[PDB]
Design a protein around this ligand. Structure first.
Ligand SMILES: CCNC(=O)c1cc2c(-c3cc(OCCN(CC)CC)c(Cl)cc3Cl)nc(N)nc2s1
Length: 208
């Protein structure tokens, strides 16, 4: 549809630039962060479903999917959680993330570690540890499907993008850095998902 371009404020620019360039050597934490976020998104819709049930609609199964694509060199994390509207995408990835981002960087300046990113509610940006481009396709019950995309150049785009395969929830598509192809391997991902699956209340499906 119509593509709108938005700018990141300075803190998010600084964070993205920090993360995309860092020599932090435990980059695998990105997966933990995205799965955690997917798990929380499933909680929001489940909560709604207790009071209504009709909120689930055509997508009753609350689950998380990890999908490597060796052909296009992408790794996807998708869920059937509550999803985000156009305003939610912007609000979540731009607006509400600012004070968390600021505090995160201050914690790093004071001896903190990159693995703490989730404490600040900005764990999503850990995606840039292994990706040079991240695409977020989302569908909330109260809006059309929208696609947010950024390559960390100071701007992001939000585009209406009809997608029948996403009835509700969020698909995060990581276009991996050239030196980060291990996260397309079946074994690597299996071992990583097993690490935290027992503590995630929803099915995590690895699609080979
Ligand atoms: C009803 C509205 N739906 C949502 O809010 C959803 C969000 C997300 C996110 C998600 C969450 C993020 O930050 C979470 C913490 N924030 C709250 C203080 C601080 C900004 C970010 Cl930065 C990016 C993404 Cl993609 N991820 C996923 N898989 N699903 C949803 S559904």
């Amino acid at each position: 549809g119509m593509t709108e371009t938005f700018a990141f404020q300075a803190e998010i620019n600084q964070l993205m630039s920090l993360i995309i360039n860092t020599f932090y050597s435990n980059k695998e934490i990105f997966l933990r962060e995205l799965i955690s976020n997917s798990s929380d998104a499933c909680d929001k819709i489940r909560y709604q479903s207790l009071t209504n049930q009709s909120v689930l609609g055509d997508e009753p199964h609350l689950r998380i999917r990890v999908i490597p694509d060796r052909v296009n060199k992408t790794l996807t994390v998708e869920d059937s959680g509550i999803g985000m509207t156009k305003a939610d995408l912007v609000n979540n990835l731009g607006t509400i993330a600012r004070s968390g981002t600021k505090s995160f960087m201050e914690a790093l300046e004071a001896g903190g570690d990159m693995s703490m990113i989730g404490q600040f509610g900005v764990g999503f940006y850990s995606a840039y540890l292994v990706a040079d481009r991240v695409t977020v396709v989302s569908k909330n019950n109260e809006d059309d499907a929208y696609t947010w995309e950024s390559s960390a150049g100071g701007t992001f785009t939000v585009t209406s993008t009809p997608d029948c395969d996403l009835k509700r929830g969020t698909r995060i598509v990581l276009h991996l850095k050239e030196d980060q192809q291990e996260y397309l391997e079946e074994r690597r991902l299996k071992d990583l998902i097993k690490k935290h699956s027992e503590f995630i209340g929803y099915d995590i499906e690895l699609m080979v």
